[PDB]
Amino acid sequence: GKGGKGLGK
Amino acid sequence: MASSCAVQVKLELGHRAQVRKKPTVEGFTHDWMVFVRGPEHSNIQHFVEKVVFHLHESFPRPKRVCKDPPYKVEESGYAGFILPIEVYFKNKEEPRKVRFDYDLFLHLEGHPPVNHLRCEKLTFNNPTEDFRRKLLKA
């Protein structure tokens, strides 16, 4: 769940 | 009866993202837009009741409902995420809706901007006459 936000494909 | 029916409809899911020239006061580095539409300007409102975009919990009012076209969300943010999209149908029979887990990915700064198109085909075996009629107007 947590820390699902990210950059890149 | 002797007769049987399979109706197929085309949906286009997609998103665009660009790095901002200046980030927002909240620290949002990207502007993005996500959408659901018919191919080649086809009017899916004939059979679509609403589209619900389930944004990440960090956004205010994260359940964004589009009862009419355009079915889209325009936002600013700092990172990509999986964005569940529910497409509700104008019917009183199953399936009432379909869900897609949409990959709302953002590129890094100094990379080309995102412009993604995802193609989905829905199949309805033996829909009701009323629902069949709505589907084939699109």
- What does the H/E/C string look like for chain B? CCCCCEEEEEEEEEEEEEECCCCCCCCCCEEEEEEEECHHHCCHHHCEEEEEEECCCCCCCCEEEECCCCEEEEEEECCEEEEEEEEEECCCCCCCEEEEEEEECCCCCCCCCEEEEEEEEEEEECCCHHHHHHHHHC
What residues of chain A lie within 8 A of the CB of B78, using their CB?
5
What kind of experiment solved this structure?
A: X-ray
The SS3 call for residue B17 is strand
Q: Residue B13 sits in which domain range?
A: 1-138
Given in angstroms, what resolution was this structure solved at? 2.0
CA distance B84 to B34: 11
Instruction: Indicate the number of domains in chain B.
Output: 1
What residues of chain B lie within 8 A of the CB of A7, using their CB?
79-80, 106-108
List, edge to edge, every strand of the sheet that includes B30-37.
Answer: B71-77, B30-37, B6-19, B114-125
> What distance in Å separates residue B133's CA from the closest CA in chain A?
39
- Number of DSSP helices (H) and strands (E) in chain A, helices first: 0, 0
The SS3 call for residue B20 is coil
A9 interfacial to chain B (CB closer than 8 Å):
yes
CA distance B97 to B86: 7
